[PDB]
Amino acid sequence: AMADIGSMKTVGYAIVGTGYFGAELGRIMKEQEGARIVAVLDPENGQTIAEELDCDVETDLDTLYSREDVEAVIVATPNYLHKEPVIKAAEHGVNVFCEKPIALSYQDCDEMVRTCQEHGVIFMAGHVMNFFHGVRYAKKLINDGVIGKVLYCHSARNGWEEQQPTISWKKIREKSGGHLYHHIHELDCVQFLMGGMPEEVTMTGGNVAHQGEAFGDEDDMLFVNMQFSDNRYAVLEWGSAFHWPEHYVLIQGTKGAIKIDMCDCGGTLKVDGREEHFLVHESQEEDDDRTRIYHGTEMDGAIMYGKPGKKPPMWLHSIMKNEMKYLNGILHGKEVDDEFRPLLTGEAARAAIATADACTKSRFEDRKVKLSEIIG
Amino acid sequence: GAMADIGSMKTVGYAIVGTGYFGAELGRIMKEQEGARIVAVLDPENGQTIAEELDCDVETDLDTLYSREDVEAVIVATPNYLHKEPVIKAAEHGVNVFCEKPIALSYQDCDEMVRTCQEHGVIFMAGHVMNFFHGVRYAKKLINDGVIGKVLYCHSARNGWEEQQPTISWKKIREKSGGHLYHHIHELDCVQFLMGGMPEEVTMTGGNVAHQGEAFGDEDDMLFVNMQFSDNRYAVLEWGSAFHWPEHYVLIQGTKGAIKIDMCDCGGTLKVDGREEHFLVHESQEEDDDRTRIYHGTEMDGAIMYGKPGKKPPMWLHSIMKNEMKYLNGILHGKEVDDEFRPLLTGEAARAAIATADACTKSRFEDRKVKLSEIIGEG
Ligand SMILES: NC(=O)c1ccc[n+]([C@@H]2O[C@H](COP(=O)([O-])OP(=O)(O)OC[C@H]3O[C@@H](n4cnc5c(N)ncnc54)[C@H](O)[C@@H]3O)[C@@H](O)[C@H]2O)c1
Ligand SMILES: NC(=O)c1ccc[n+]([C@@H]2O[C@H](COP(=O)([O-])OP(=O)(O)OC[C@H]3O[C@@H](n4cnc5c(N)ncnc54)[C@H](O)[C@@H]3O)[C@@H](O)[C@H]2O)c1
């Protein structure tokens, strides 16, 4: 509207990593008012996406970020290649949006957050599950006291992956971190719901059914047992060797419970002997579409993993728009909502990777691990 | 049966030690079995009443009871902490033993009970009655038949919401019941049956999160167990009484498919090769649906599901008690023990259940992962 003048500067975005997710974030951000995609860097797919978005290609991160028209960057490289794009952005005074998992070590994540703070640039952690209607609603119910004190969260993200003709980087521990880091969404969600990191974790599991030359080396079953301060608990399950598919977050408090189901897609509140239902995504059509995708891909979860040339489904495209609108607002000086502030302070980024590192160490060293061992 | 069953059957004389909710009903059931007689009961509070109902004698002393010429076997249905002396003294008198779960509240006790019965050459049947559920027998058949391939992972839950009762049952006193883990050991025994024995290593976490008014009972109301089995296999087991999202099931996941035994929304599911099949957990669709009705009635307070003297087990439980008492009576009339039930007679399922429960307990109290070798040694 006419009243927007004063607030509608064009923010120039770079995209580093324009595959499945980076190309689609670029498509979405290009459509946002006051945003332009000026340049992309992606050795394999940059030329193709630059032609689609009508923007430039760069090949060197310092050259890209030295451009006067590059003010912000969306970092959507593979999980193991987030650090250099973020560090060099901060060194050039470029504002950062970074895909999950922020990094595959706490040291990397800590350095990325710290370097952005030292250079006075924004660092937004792309923990997109926080934008789900169902998650926002669960947090509101908790804040409103509807389920009393949260005692216990149980998450699962369990399916069956068939042998593929090729092994994606997403299946290789050194490149993806495996399920715990690639699917860190659930861990971050539980930490948001329970008010931070646990004190101590145990993780068990292994590669039970995907060992050999035709498979990646990631664990295909992971089971986390978290002990929080003040006598509270969480159980988190992941993997790719489960012929009983489950994907949900279950929240149990002194007065009620909340389930966010992403397989039979929908939210349930139990309180005082009644049930209420709520949407996980932004419409019944989005929830029902997600249900159809899970039912259609039951015999092989590998089909849900993005790769260059593929497009995110309806529910994911829709929340990516919400998240890119939120980022664009922050970069046009809209005040950070309390609810999402931990995605900008570094607190959620550090907490997610600290706990993931503690779980990893617990599983590989076969012992309980205190978060203090990771964070100091 | 068969043509060979013609002729009078030898009567086996049964004692019952503990005739509360469960012992009184086991007596009613065994009395109806051919070739079985209930001859005497010992129960300080309820023995006179149950003996009048079953038309049998009352004893007050275990050695006197077992020295009776007519006592050949005993059903031990005392509270969880009072199983050892009735079993040991039965064995010392050459009396065959059926013992309620949990066999005992320590591995030392359980092991001594098994060893003493072996020393005296008497039968010792572990009353792990969940092995007599139609849906558990069917799940085992599917697994043995290779339908779901190698079992990789079992997940059990037995989670509800219990209100504090005006007066506290022995079942809520940890030294008397052993708390959820031992009083509801059914799920732990079920997982170990399906995964072929004890795990190598366990972790248990939990606490009294919502029953601070009952802290004197020293029981956790939430328990979470993480089991690591040999050859890269796992289990997760949940229990407790502070869960406003009720769940009671055993989920079995293998290389080729999965089986769920649901005891809340009562029914079995097989998932394999892109299809689902339904099967019964109990003896009929009516028994499953009755169990579902019971769980809907107890959702706001699971405390009402606990038996106490004067109460009768529900239909599904009466049915498996009949299955189990018929099995026991057959063994005591010289029927050969099936491979399926043999671990209930060898001591192996009894020792495995209590060994793992003790390891879980130690893990929770010491706040660390515990190897089963700490309990059982290096073999
Ligand atoms: N919902 C979500 O938040 C969501 C979903 C999918 C993926 N992701 C995240 O998005 C990121 C990318 O995953 P994806 O699904 O797009 O993977 P993808 O394999 O589809 O794309 C990765 C792209 O990175 C490019 N690339 C590789 N090395 C590079 C380098 N050095 N510099 C620049 N580009 C490089 C590749 O050429 C490719 O185009 C990861 O962090 C992943 O975890 C997030
Ligand atoms: N397998 C199952 O499905 C199932 C279900 C319920 C109970 N049980 C088991 O049955 C046993 C008894 O539980 P319950 O539900 O009947 O409890 P209950 O409280 O109803 O009955 C316990 C009985 O033990 C008697 N008793 C107490 N001390 C005794 C002693 N020293 N000698 C003899 N009798 C004594 C009491 O008088 C009472 O009659 C326990 O092992 C319990 O775990 C098993």
Residue numbers in the entry:
A (entry chain BBB): 2 to 377
B (entry chain AAA): 1 to 379
Tell me what the authors wrote about this structure, in their words.
RgNanOx (RUMGNA_02695) from R. gnavus ATCC 29149 catalyzes the equilibration of 2,7-anhydro-Neu5Ac and Neu5Ac. The protein shows a Rossman fold typical of NAD-binding protein of the Gfo/Idh/MocA class characterized by a central β-sheet with helices on either side. Here, we showed that RgNanOx acts through a multistep mechanism involving a keto intermediate and cycling of NADH/NAD+.
In the RgNanOx structure, there is additional density adjacent to the nicotinamide ring that, given the high resolution of the second structure, we were able to unambiguously identify as citric acid from the crystallization buffer. Using the high-resolution structure, we used a simple modeling approach to place a molecule of DANA a transition state analog inhibitor of sialidases, in RgNanOx active site by overlapping the carboxylate acid of the DANA with each of the three carboxylate groups of citric acid. Next we manually positioned the sugar such that the H3 of the atom ring pointed toward the C4′ of the nicotinamide, as would be required for hydride transfer. Only one position where the DANA carboxylate was placed on the 2-carboxylic acid of citric remained positioned for hydride transfer. The model indicated that His-178, predicted to be a catalytic residue, is positioned to remove the proton from O4 during the oxidation step. His-176 is plausibly positioned to undertake proton transfer with the O7 of the substrate glycerol that the mechanism requires. His-175 interacts with the negatively charged carboxylic acid in the model but could play a role in proton transfer at the substrate C3 atom. Lys-163 binds to the NAD+ co-factor and interacts with the substrate carboxylate.
